[PDB]
Amino acid sequence: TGLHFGRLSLRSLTAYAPNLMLWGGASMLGLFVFTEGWPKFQDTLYKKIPL
Amino acid sequence: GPPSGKTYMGWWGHMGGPKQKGITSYAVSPYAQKPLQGIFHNAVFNSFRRFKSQFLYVLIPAGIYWYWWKNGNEYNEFLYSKAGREELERVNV
Amino acid sequence: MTAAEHGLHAPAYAWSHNGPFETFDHASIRRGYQVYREVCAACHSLDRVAWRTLVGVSHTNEEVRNMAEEFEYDDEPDEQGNPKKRPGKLSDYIPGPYPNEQAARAANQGALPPDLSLIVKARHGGCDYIFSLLTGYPDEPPAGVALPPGSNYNPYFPGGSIAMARVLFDDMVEYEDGTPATTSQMAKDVTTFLNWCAEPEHDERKRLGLKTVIILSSLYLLSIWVKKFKWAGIKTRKFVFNPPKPRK
Amino acid sequence: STVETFISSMTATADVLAMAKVEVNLAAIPLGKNVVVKWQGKPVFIRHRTPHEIQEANSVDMSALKDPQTDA
Amino acid sequence: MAFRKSNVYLSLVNSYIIDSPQPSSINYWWNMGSLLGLCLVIQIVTGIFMAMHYSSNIELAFSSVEHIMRDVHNGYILRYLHANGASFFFMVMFMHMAKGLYYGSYRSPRVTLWNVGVIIFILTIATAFLGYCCVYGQMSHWGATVITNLFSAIPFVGNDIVSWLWGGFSVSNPTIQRFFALHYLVPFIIAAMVIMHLMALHIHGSSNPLGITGNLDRIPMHSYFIFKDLVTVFLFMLILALFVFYSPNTLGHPDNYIPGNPLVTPASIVPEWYLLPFYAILRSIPDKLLGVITMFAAILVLLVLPFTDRSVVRGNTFKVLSKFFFFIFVFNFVLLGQIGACHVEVPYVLMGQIATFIYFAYFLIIVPVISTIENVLFYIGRVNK
Amino acid sequence: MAFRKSNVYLSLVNSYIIDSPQPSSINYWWNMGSLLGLCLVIQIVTGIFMAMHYSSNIELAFSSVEHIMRDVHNGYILRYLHANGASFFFMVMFMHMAKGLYYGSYRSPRVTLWNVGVIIFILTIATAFLGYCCVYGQMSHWGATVITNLFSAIPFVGNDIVSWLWGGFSVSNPTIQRFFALHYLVPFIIAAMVIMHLMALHIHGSSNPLGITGNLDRIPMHSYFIFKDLVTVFLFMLILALFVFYSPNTLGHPDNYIPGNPLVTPASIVPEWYLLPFYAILRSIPDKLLGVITMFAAILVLLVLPFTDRSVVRGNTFKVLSKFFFFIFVFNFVLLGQIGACHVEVPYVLMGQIATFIYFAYFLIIVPVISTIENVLFYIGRVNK
Amino acid sequence: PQSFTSIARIGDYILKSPVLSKLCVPVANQFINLAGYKKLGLKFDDLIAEENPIMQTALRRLPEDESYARAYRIIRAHQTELTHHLLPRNEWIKAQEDVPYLLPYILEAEAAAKEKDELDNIEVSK
C-alpha cells in the first residue's frame, strides 16, 4: 500500500505524461516557426507545399 | 505592500531566535577603553596558536601537489633532453 | 619543447633602472638614440615614437627640430592637386626605412624586421633578452647544427636560427661624450633606449607609485587603528548566565 | 520576424561576403613558383606542379601515411 | 520615525548598508563581497574613461590602446588599473567562491543566492574574455579564434553559429566591433545580477563561520562592518597600487603587445592567467564537442553542489576530512591552472586528465561520501550503546 | 501563499505588474508610462545592434552610418527605427508630462515622483543630443559647436570647461569619441532613474482623472491594464511602422546627410524638432549667460510647480479657467517650437520674447492666481450668506 | 539532508556490532576532539543547522531550561569566535556533558514527517 514517490507521484507522472508529449510537440512547432529563414534548416523545412 | 514568505531572519525586535532569559551583557565605552592593548603578546602567542591548530590541513595538500608537480616537471625536462630521447620516442608513439 | 626551441634563458643583468626607485639613465638614452640612428634605423621602423617625446628627455628642442627636418613627409597637396613633400616637424613620427612590408621582406631575404617601439615589452625577459640577443652571437655555431643559408645562430633566439646579422662590432659608432663604444656598451645603450621607447611614462610612474604606496600604507594603518577602536565595545563584551527559576 | 531581424543583423554583412572569393590566374603563375595569399582570412599555398612531381605524388605507398589518401 | 526609515530611497540604503543585522562572529572572509563591489566600480569607471579614447576598428584598435598609454594624460594609470584590476577582480571572486564552498553558504535556505552567484561568475568570464579580445594583440586574436572554433564543434548547426559570431569568415573588423559593443554592455547586466544577488542575500542574512544560527547576537552594519570593510578596502587598494605602479605587466602575457596578425601563429597560445584551469579542463578531453560540454559542465557542477552536501552541520569549520579534501580541491584548481599554462606534452596530458577527474570527483563523489562518513562519525562518537 | 508572492524575485513582478492596485477610472492617458518603457527598450535594443557596426572616429562616423544603411542586412530598419523612435520617445514623453500637468499628478504626496520625472527628462534630452552629435552630419557638428559655446558663456571658468568638453580646440575626433561613450552610458542611468521613478510611484499608487481618492474601487493590474496597455502598444507600433517604413526622413533635417564640414556653415542651423522650444527660449534672450540660465530655468520651473498650485482640488478636470489656460500653455509650447524653427527675423524675435514670457508666466503667475480665484469661486457658488 | 533515521540506523548497526565498535569508536572520539567544537563551549546538538522546518519543529518541542542553556552556549560561542580566542580549559564542554539531548525530539519529528508522507501516498487494499 505504498507508492514510488520523490514528492512527485508515479501516478501523477503517468497522469501528466500524455500531456507532456503534446508539450514536446508544441515546442517543436514553436522551433519550426522560429527557425525558418535559417537556410541550414531549410534543407528539411520546405518539403510538401511551402516552396 | 504584499506579505512575503517565512524567512529565517527578522529585524530588530522580532529577529526570530529562541526566547532568552537571564543572560546579561556587559560592555564598556571605547572612549574609556584602550584600543590595541592586545597586539603585543597577542600577535605572537595567539598567532602561533592559530597557526599550530590550522597549518597541517594546508601543508599536507600543498606538499602532495608540489611534490607531484616537481616530479612531473623533472620528468618533462628529462625526456626532452638528449638522454631520454629514445624514451620520448617510445612514449610519444 | 627542448631547450633549443625555447631558447636559452637570458640572465639577470643589473640595470640602472631596476628597483622601485631608480629611474632611467638619460645620458644612456641619448647614446642609445645615436646607436639606433646609426645602426638599427637602416632596417627597423620606430613607428610609435613621435619626435616631441624626445624633447626634454634625451635631446633639447633645437636638436630634435634639426633631426626631424632632415626627413621628408607628405604635405597637403598644392592648389593643383599635385602631391608635395615637406620637411619634418616636432609633431610627426620617426619614419621607417621601408615604405611597406614587401620592400622589407625583399631587402631582408624574406624575414620581416619587427618594429622596435614595443620590443622590450613584447619579449619575455625584456631588457636582458634584448641585450643577450645582441651580444650573444657565437663566432661559429655549435658542432652539428645545419643552418639554413642566409640565417645566423645565437642561442637566445627561440629555435637558434635567427635571420639577423651580427651588427654590433667594436667602435663602429663614435659617441659625442667620448665614451668607449664597445659592443656591450652600445647594446646596453640601445636596450635602455628601447626601454624608454616602450615605457615613456616610467619615471613619472615610479614617483606616483611612491606617493600612492606611502599614502595607502598610512591609510591602511590608520584604518586598522579605527577598526580596533570602534570594535572595542564588542571585543571586550562579557556574558554571564545564571539559569532562571524553572517554575515559570 | 523581430527575432529574425535582430539576429540576422549580426551575420556576415554584404561587403564581407563580397570578399569571400579570390579568382587567381592560372596563366599568370609560373611553373617553379609558390604563391602564398591571404584568402578568407587564411593562408593558401598555390603551386604549379610538374608531371614527375605527379608521379612522385601518386606512387608513394599508403602505409607510409598515417592518413592515406590518393592524389585525385 | 527617522528619516532614513521613512523615506522611500533611503530605506533601501538603511536596510542594506546601515541597519542590516549582521552576525557578530564573521571574520575577514565575509568582506570579499564589498571588495568585489568596489572592484566592479573601479572596472566600470576606468572602462568609461578609457573608452572615451578607444576606436574599435580592427586597423585602429591596437594603435588606439597605445594612444591611450602614450598620448592621453594619465592614460597608463587607466589601462594598468583596468587590466590589473580585472586580474584582482577574478582573484577576489575566486576567494569569494572559496568562502562560499568552505563555510557552506550554498546550502539551504541560500540556494537562490548561490545560483545567482554562478550566473554572475559566467557573465564575468564572458566580460573578461570580450574585453581581452578588444585589445587585438596576438593573444587576443588567436584566443578569439580558438574559442569560436570551439563553438563550431556543435553538431549540424555550429558552422553557421560561428559565421554569425564572427560576422564574416574569420576574426575580422565586425568581430572586434561587436566584441566591443557586447563588452560595453554585459557589465551592466552584471550590475543588475549583483542587485538581484543582494536581494536573495537580504531575505535571509549572511551566514557565520560556525554554521549555527546568528539570530541571537546581531550587530548592525553601520560603523562596525563599515570600518572593517574600510580596512580591507585600503589593503586592496594598496596591493592594487603595487601591481599597477611598480610591476604592471607581470600578470599579462608579453605576446599581447605584438599587433594582431592573422598569418603568424604564436609559439604558445595561452589565455590570461585565470581562465587557465578551464582551458586545461577543455584541453584534457580528446574531443571537441565533449571538450566544450565539459568546460561548461565545470561551472554547472557548482550548481549541482547543494544537492550533494549531505552533511547535517553547515560548513567545514568543525569537520576534519571535509576541510582536508577542501584544500586538496583548492590546490588541485591551482594545479589545473599550471597544467593549462604548459604545452601539450608528456606527462601534462595525463596529469591534466587526472586533475580534471579529481575536480569532478570532488564535486560529485568526495563531498557526499565524506559528508556521510563524517555524519556517522559525529553520531557514534558521542552516542553510547 | 502563492509562488508569485513568496519568491523574492517574483514578488517585485507581482507587486508591480500583476497585483498592483490601480484606480478603476483611469483613461488612456495613464498608458503613456508603459508606452515610454516600451519605447526605451526599443531605443536600447536598436542602439546595441546598430552600435555593433559603428566606428566613432571623426573620419569614419558618417561613413559607418552609411555602411549601416547600405551594407548591413536590415540596417535601414535599425537606423530608421532608432531615429524615428527617438522622435516618438520625446512625443510620448511630452504627452506624459502634459498628463502630469493636467491631472495634477505633481501635487502632494507625489512631489518625489515629479522630481525624479524632471531628472529623467533632463537625462533624456542629454542622451538625444549626444546621439544626434554621434551622426556627425552638418547639423550634428554645428549644433555641437553652438551648444558648447553656450557653455563657454560661464564667467571666469567657462573657456577651460569648453576646452575640457571638446578635448581639444574645436569639435574634433576626441569630442565625437567621448560623445559616443557618454551616449552609450547615459541610457543606463535613465534606466536606473526609471526604476527609482517606479518606486516613488508605487509608494502611493497612481492618480485618477477625477482628483479624488481611488482607495475605494481598485482593480488589479493583471489582464485589465495589461490588455489596455497592449492596445496602445499595438497602436504605437502601428504609427511607428508608418513613419519608419513609408516616410522615414520626414522628422529629420535633410542637412544631416551632408558630411560634417567645419569650414562651411549652413544657411540655417536648427536642432532636431523637439529641442526647438528650448532653443527658442535661449535665442529669445539678448545675452549668452542669461540665455543659458533661462534655458535651464525653463526646466527647473517645472520643479517649482507643486508649490504654486494653490488649488484645493487635484487636477484641472472640474475647473474651467485652469483647463483653458492649460491649453493656452500647450499651444504656446507648440508656438515656441515653431518660432525656434524660423530665422532671427522681424517679428519672430518679439514673438519669441512674448512666448517665453507667457511660458514663465503660466508656471509662475497664471497658475496660482487662477487657482486662488477658482477656489473662491467654488466656495461662494454653493455657500449662502 | 541526512534524514536522522538513516544516520541513527547506521550508528546503531555500528554500535551493536562488537568488531565495528571496537574498530571505529576510538576513531570516532578522536575525530570528535580533533573537531574542536568543545573548545568553543558547544555541544553537537547545538551545532546541527536549524533552518529547515523539521528541525524548527524539534526546537519548538524543546523544554525551556535547555533552550535557555542552548541560547547561552550559542552567544558565548559567537563571542569567543569574535575575540579569536578559545574558552579556558575549565570552561570546555567535557565528554560527559556532550549528551545527545535534542536527538529524540529530532527523531520523533522525523518519524512524524515520514509517516505523513507515506500516508499521503498510499494505495488502497483492493
Ligand SMILES: CCCCCCCCCCC(=O)OC[C@H](COP(=O)(O)OC[C@H](O)COP(=O)(O)OC[C@@H](COC(=O)CC)OC(=O)CCC)OC(=O)CCCCCCCC
Ligand atoms: C592576493 C590579492 C588579493 C587582494 C585582496 C586584498 C585583501 C586581502 C584579504 C586577505 C584576507 O582577507 O585574509 C583574511 C585572514 C583571516 O582573518 P581573521 O579574521 O581569521 O584574523 C583575525 C585577526 O587576527 C583580527 O585582528 P584585527 O581585526 O584587529 O586586525 C586584522 C589585520 C588586518 O589584516 C587583514 O585584513 C588581512 C591581512 O590587522 C593587522 O593587524 C595587520 C597587521 C599588518 O587574515 C588572516 O588573519 C591570515 C590568515 C591566513 C590567510 C592567508 C591568505 C592567503 C590567501
Ligand SMILES: CCCCCCCCCCCCCCCCCC(=O)OC[C@H](COP(=O)(O)OCCN)OC(=O)CCCCCCCCCCCCC
Ligand atoms: C570554479 C570554482 C572556483 C573555486 C575557487 C578555487 C579556490 C580559489 C583559491 C582562493 C584561495 C582561497 C583559500 C580558501 C579560502 C577559505 C579558507 C578559509 O576559510 O580560511 C579559514 C580556514 C579555517 O578557519 P576556521 O574558520 O575553521 O577557524 C575556526 C576556529 N575554530 O583557515 C585555514 O585553514 C588557512 C587558510 C589559508 C588559505 C591558503 C590559501 C592558498 C591559496 C593558494 C596558494 C597557491 C600557491 C601555492
Ligand SMILES: CCCCCCCCCCCCCCCCCC(=O)OC[C@H](COP(=O)(O)OCCN)OC(=O)CCCCCCCCCCCCC
Ligand atoms: C517643458 C515642459 C513640457 C510641457 C509639454 C507641453 C505639452 C506638449 C504637447 C503635448 C500635447 C499633449 C496634450 C494632452 C493634454 C493632456 C491630456 C488631456 O488633458 O486630455 C483630457 C481632456 C479633458 O478630459 P477630462 O479628464 O476633463 O474628462 C472629463 C470627463 N467628465 O480632453 C481634452 O480636453 C481634449 C484632448 C485633446 C488632445 C489633443 C492634443 C493636442 C496636441 C497639440 C498638437 C498641436 C499640433 C498642431
Ligand code: HEC
Ligand atoms: C567601457 C566600459 C568597460 C567596462 C564597463 C569594463 N571594461 Fe574591461 N575594457 C574596456 C576597454 C575599452 C578595454 C580595452 C582597452 C584596454 O584593454 O585597455 C577593456 C579591456 C579589458 C580587459 C583586457 C585588458 C588588457 O589590456 O589586456 C580585461 C581583462 C577586462 N577589460 C575586464 C573587464 C571586467 C572583468 C570588467 C567588469 C566586470 C570590465 N572589463 C568592465 C572597457 C570596459
Ligand code: HEC
Ligand atoms: C548603443 C546604445 C544606444 C542607446 C542605448 C541609445 N542610442 Fe541613440 N544612438 C546610438 C547610436 C550608435 C547612434 C548613432 C547612429 C545613428 O544615428 O543611426 C544613435 C543616435 C541617436 C540619435 C540620432 C539619430 C539620427 O540618425 O539622427 C538620436 C536622436 C538618439 N540616438 C536618441 C536616443 C535616445 C532618446 C535614447 C534612449 C533614451 C537612445 N538614443 C539610446 C546608440 C544608442
Ligand code: HEC
Ligand atoms: C641587417 C639588418 C638589421 C639591422 C641592421 C638590425 N636588425 Fe634587428 N632584425 C633584423 C631582422 C631581419 C630581424 C628579424 C629577425 C627574425 O624575424 O627572425 C631583426 C629582429 C630584431 C629583433 C627581434 C628579434 C626577435 O627574435 O624577436 C630585435 C630585438 C632586433 N632586431 C634588434 C636590433 C637592434 C637593436 C638593432 C640595432 C642595433 C638591429 N636590430 C639592427 C635585421 C636587422
Ligand code: HEC
Ligand atoms: C559563485 C559564488 C558567488 C559569486 C561568484 C559571487 N557571490 Fe556574492 N555571495 C555569494 C554567497 C554564497 C554569499 C553569502 C555567503 C554567506 O554569507 O555565507 C555572497 C554574499 C555576498 C555579499 C554579502 C557580503 C558577504 O561577503 O557575504 C555581497 C556584498 C556580495 N555577495 C556581492 C557579490 C558581488 C558584487 C559579486 C560579483 C559581482 C559576487 N558577490 C559574486 C556567492 C557568490
Ligand code: HEC
Ligand atoms: C517629469 C514628468 C515625468 C517624466 C518626464 C516621466 N514621468 Fe512617469 N510619471 C510621472 C508622473 C507625474 C506620474 C504619475 C501619474 C499620475 O499623476 O498619476 C508618472 C507615472 C509613471 C508611470 C506609471 C504609469 C503611469 O502612466 O502613471 C510609469 C510607468 C512611468 N511614469 C514611467 C516613466 C518613464 C518610463 C519615463 C521615462 C523613461 C517617465 N515616466 C518620465 C511624471 C513623469
Ligand SMILES: COc1c(O)c(C)c(C/C=C(\C)CC/C=C(\C)CC/C=C(/C)CC/C=C(\C)CC/C=C(\C)CCC=C(C)C)c(O)c1OC
Ligand atoms: C502604475 O501602474 C504601472 C506600473 O506599476 C508599472 C510597473 C508599469 C510598467 C513599467 C514598465 C514596464 C517600465 C519598465 C522599464 C524598465 C525596467 C527599463 C529596463 C529596460 C531595459 C532595456 C532593460 C535592459 C536590458 C538589456 C539592455 C538587455 C538587452 C541585451 C541584448 C539585446 C543583448 C543582445 C546580444 C546578443 C549576443 C543576443 C506600468 O506600465 C504601469 O502602468 C500600467
Ligand SMILES: COc1c(O)c(C)c(C/C=C(\C)CC/C=C(\C)CC/C=C(\C)CC/C=C(\C)CC/C=C(/C)CCC=C(C)C)c(O)c1OC
Ligand atoms: C551584505 O551587506 C552589504 C550590502 O547590503 C551592500 C549593498 C554592500 C555594497 C555592495 C555594492 C555596492 C555592490 C553593488 C555594485 C553596484 C550596484 C555597481 C554600481 C555601479 C555602477 C552602476 C557604475 C557607476 C556609474 C557611475 C558612477 C556613473 C558616473 C560615471 C561617469 C563616468 C560620469 C562621468 C562623466 C562626466 C561628464 C563627468 C555591501 O558591501 C555589503 O556588505 C557589507
Ligand SMILES: CCCCCCCCCCCCCCC(=O)O[C@H](COC(=O)CCCCCCCCCCCC)COP(=O)(O)O
Ligand atoms: C559602491 C562602492 C562600494 C565600495 C565598498 C566600500 C565599503 C567601505 C565604505 C567606507 C565608507 C566610510 C564611511 C564611514 C562614515 O561615514 O562614518 C561616519 C563618520 O566617520 C568618519 O568620519 C570616517 C572618517 C572618514 C573616512 C573616509 C573614508 C573614505 C575612503 C572610502 C574608500 C572607498 C570608497 C559616521 O561615523 P559614526 O557613526 O561612528 O559617528
Ligand SMILES: CCCCCCCCCCCCCCC(=O)O[C@H](COC(=O)CCCCCCCCCCCC)COP(=O)(O)O
Ligand atoms: C519591458 C517592456 C515593457 C513593454 C510594455 C508592454 C505592456 C503590455 C504587455 C503585454 C503582455 C501580454 C501578456 C498577457 C498574458 O500573458 O495573459 C495571459 C494569457 O493571455 C494571452 O494568452 C494573451 C494572448 C497573447 C498576447 C501576446 C502579446 C505579445 C505581444 C507583446 C508586445 C509587447 C512586448 C493570462 O491571461 P488570463 O489571466 O486572462 O487567463
Ligand SMILES: CCCCCCCCCCCCCCCCCC(=O)O[C@H](COC(=O)CCCCCC)COP(=O)(O)OCCN
Ligand atoms: C543603482 C540604483 C538602482 C536602484 C536602487 C534604488 C536605490 C537608490 C539609492 C539612492 C540613495 C540616494 C538617494 C537620496 C535621495 C533622498 C532625497 C529624498 O528622498 O527627498 C525626497 C524628495 O526627493 C527628490 O525630490 C529628489 C530625489 C532624487 C534622487 C536622485 C538620486 C523628499 O520626499 P519625502 O520622502 O519627504 O516625501 C514627502 C512627499 N512630499
Ligand SMILES: CCCCCCCCCCCCCCCCCC(=O)O[C@H](COC(=O)CCCCCC)COP(=O)(O)OCCN
Ligand atoms: C535593479 C533591479 C533590476 C531588476 C531586478 C528586479 C526584477 C527581477 C525580476 C526577475 C523576474 C524573473 C525571475 C523569475 C525566476 C524565479 C525562479 C526562482 O526564483 O527560483 C528560485 C531559484 O532561482 C534560481 O535558482 C536562479 C534564479 C536566477 C534568476 C535569473 C533571471 C527558488 O526560489 P525559492 O527559494 O522561493 O524556492 C523554494 C522551493 N519551493
